[PDB]
Amino acid sequence: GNDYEDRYYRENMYRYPNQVYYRPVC
């Protein structure tokens, strides 16, 4: 719907190989 939710989520790439999260995020 909204490009913020859309981009919110498209940000799921941050959910992907998150630059350190090695995925766990901690």
Curated annotation (Swiss-Prot):
Coiled coil: none annotated. It is found in: Cell membrane; Golgi apparatus. This protein is produced by a bicistronic gene which also produces the major prion protein/PRNP from an overlapping reading frame. The alternative prion protein/AltPrP (AC F7VJQ3) and PRNP have no apparent direct functional relation since a mutation that removes the start codon of the AltPrP has no apparent effect on the biology of PRNP. In mouse and hamster, the alternative initiation AUG codon is absent and is replaced by a GUG codon. It is linked to Found in high quantity in the brain of humans and animals infected with degenerative neurological diseases such as kuru, Creutzfeldt-Jakob disease (CJD), Gerstmann-Straussler syndrome (GSS), scrapie, bovine spongiform encephalopathy (BSE), transmissible mink encephalopathy (TME), etc. Its primary physiological function is unclear. Has cytoprotective activity against internal or environmental stresses. May play a role in neuronal development and synaptic plasticity. May be required for neuronal myelin sheath maintenance. May play a role in iron uptake and iron homeostasis. Soluble oligomers are toxic to cultured neuroblastoma cells and induce apoptosis (in vitro). Association with GPC1 (via its heparan sulfate chains) targets PRNP to lipid rafts. Also provides Cu(2+) or Zn(2+) for the ascorbate-mediated GPC1 deaminase degradation of its heparan sulfate side chains. The normal, monomeric form has a mainly alpha-helical structure. The disease-associated, protease-resistant form forms amyloid fibrils containing a cross-beta spine, formed by a steric zipper of superposed beta-strands. Disease mutations may favor intermolecular contacts via short beta strands, and may thereby trigger oligomerization. Belongs to the prion family. Monomer and homodimer. Has a tendency to aggregate into amyloid fibrils containing a cross-beta spine, formed by a steric zipper of superposed beta-strands. Soluble oligomers may represent an intermediate stage on the path to fibril formation. Copper binding may promote oligomerization. Interacts with GRB2, APP, ERI3/PRNPIP and SYN1. Mislocalized cytosolically exposed PrP interacts with MGRN1; this interaction alters MGRN1 subcellular location and causes lysosomal enlargement. Interacts with KIAA1191. This is Major prion protein. It comes from Ovis aries (Sheep). The lineage of its organism: Eukaryota, Metazoa, Chordata, Craniata, Vertebrata.
